[model samples]
Target: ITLEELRYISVFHSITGVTAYRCIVDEENNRLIFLVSEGEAGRAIGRGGRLIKLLREALGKNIEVVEYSSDLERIVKNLFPGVKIESINVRERNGVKQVVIKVSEDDKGAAIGKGGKNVKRARLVLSKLFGVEKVVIR
Candidate 1:
């Protein structure tokens, strides 16, 4: 993270009154991902999600706020927040561990997001933090 990014994260916390655990900027895609304090996802989003709306318009990028979790399943759940996670299966293939996350049938589309952006973002972060190689949404 750079100085400007830190400043932006600070500004976000100041506006939303929520602590951020980490922030990732996807410059190519114009997206900002904030890893917020545990159990404070709603607080960070604000009533009616005005905070995100404001940030998106001002920053010119999609903004995602995710809760920090110690558990892999919980972290995966946060990637698809507001969606029900039926189960998460961890398996190993060729010495590489993968995650299969099962969400509600109706939520499959949203969980995958447009052009699989959501799943790709989840995979990047999961691999960065946990060494997970793949994420399959089912």
Candidate 2:
């Protein structure tokens, strides 16, 4: 993590009382994605998302709390909350692991997000956390 991200993480912990496993700064979208330990998402988010609002106001960026997990399915589900996922398939080829996620037709746009921001975020996190080479959303 960069110096700015380290500072952000410090502020995050101070405000939410939950330590983050990692913090991804999406400069393109002016967003901060905090990867907190499993089962601590509730604490990080606080009741009614008030903690997230405080983080946003404190850091002056959009804040997203993602719970870290070894399970790929759970990670994907956490990333795209409220989107209907039909299935998730993992394939290995040439020593590379690729993931395919099928979402309901109506929810496809939501899964992908505006200008593919959501999908991009998913790919970054999956690759970094799970060694996934590619993420396909269909």
Candidate 3:
């Protein structure tokens, strides 16, 4: 996250009384992805998604709240809710295991999102937390 982005996220955390582990901005899609601290996801989003609405308006972008987790697969699942991930394969490269995630054809488009925004986000978090080199959605 950039300094400007962190400033906004900091204010958001102050308002919601929750801490986030990471914040990603998808400028092309006009979206913001927030990975809130574990059980605090509920508090960050608030009841009936009130916090999300307010944040979207304030930030002037689409907001997505993802619950933080140590399990990479679980985090990917949460990031792509409702999209059935058939499997996750860790293929070996030059000492680095790349991630290949297979999702149902029915949800392929949704998992990829417009201009591949969703998959890009998945790749980012996976890379940052698990050292995943790739996230191929098939």
Candidate 4:
């Protein structure tokens, strides 16, 4: 991890009382994506999301907290909260692992987010944590 990422993670831990597994700096979107340990998402977000607001103000960027999980289904559920996931399929192609997530039609756009930003973040985070090469929304 870079020094900047380490600093961000340290600040996050101190402010939220939750340790992050990794932090992905999305300069294009002007956001910080933090992967915290499983089951600590609520704590990281803080009550009423106060900590996120504090982090954003302190770091000068949007703060997104994603819970890390070894199980693909669990992680997907964490990524798209409140969205109904029909199924999660993992496929291997040319030594690459690709993930296919099936969600309700109405939730598709929401899961993908504006300009596909959420899906893009999912791809990057999953690739780094799970070696996933691609993420497909279906």
Candidate 5:
């Protein structure tokens, strides 16, 4: 995530009351996904999605929510219904190759871990898997 996203995370989560950075920005897709944690999931949606209505107004952008989980594959499945990802492919090289990854709210965080360690790792794995020069997640 970028500095802008961090700011949104603070603002969004503060209002939404999530424990961690559960906000996933999909600028290319022009959408945002909020990860709802456990019992907070019910409150996250806030009565017939009234909260979402407020969120979109405040954000001036499309807002969507997904239930939070630690599993990456499950996240991908939720984000892309009927789109199956059997496994994660990776490669190693001078740097991670240029590749674009598509995943759900759960997997996005795994793809972009603390300080973006996972981002760099994804590049390397993808470099070898696809034999690319660089990988860009879209």
Candidate 6:
């Protein structure tokens, strides 16, 4: 599953006393991880790690539930400073990874950089050594 899809699924399933959280199966590696909101973190993980065991059995594999906070948006912004778009997405992938950054027409220059040197540098660095896909600056 995509990162955004998993995130939203976690939020959706946690709405009630659901004891299990699983991935969409199509995600790379097929490993499942959960993201829990603060204040609800303990409730999600439960006391003494009992809930997780049940979750593993239910999900048919060992799964992990991680505590997340309402501060996610701020955390994202802080991680990538100078981003003015109003939205952000964090993703991890096989090999290196890819970043798809969507910006207004004016801001495209900032991403592309002078003489396209910045983007060329990024591509070389990311693709040659890191195997990351080219960043989409649009």
Identify the candidate with maximal lDDT.
2
Assess the local accuracy of residue 21 in candidate 4 as a C-alpha lDDT between 0 and 100. 89
| lDDT of candidate 5 over 1-138, digit per residue (tens) | 578767767767666666433566656546666666645656766778877777787787777665544554444334333333445433445754344455554555555655564454434333323355554444
Lowest lDDT 10-mer window, candidate 1?
Answer: 20-29
Q: Least accurate stretch of 10 residues (summed lDDT) in model 3?
A: 20-29
In candidate 6, residue 113 scores what lDDT?
54
Please give me the total number of clashing residue pairs in predicted model 1.
0
Per-residue CA lDDT of model 4 for 23-122, tens digit only, reads 9888889999999887788888877999999999889999999888889899999888868999999999788999999998888978998998899888
Off by over 4 Å in 6: 1-30, 69-138
Arrange candidates by TM-score, highest first: which order? 4, 2, 3, 1, 5, 6
lDDT of 3: 0.81
Error of 4 at 8 (Å): 1.0
**TM-scores for all predictions:** 0.79, 0.86, 0.82, 0.92, 0.51, 0.35
Window of ten residues with lowest summed lDDT in model 2: 104-113
What's the distance in Å from true for residue 136, model 6?
Answer: 18
> lDDT (CA) for every model shown?
0.82, 0.91, 0.81, 0.90, 0.55, 0.48
What's model 4's lDDT at 75?
Answer: 90
Tens digit per residue, CA lDDT, model 2, 1-138: 678879988999999999988898888899999999888999999889999999999999999999988899999999999798889999998889999999987788889989999998998889888889899988
Off by over 4 Å in 3: 95-97
Please report, as a residue range, the 10-residue window in candidate 4 with the lowest summed lDDT: 38-47
> Residue 36 CA error for candidate 4 (Å)?
1.5
Write candidate 1's Cα lDDT for 12-46 as tens digits: 77778787777777775678888887878888888
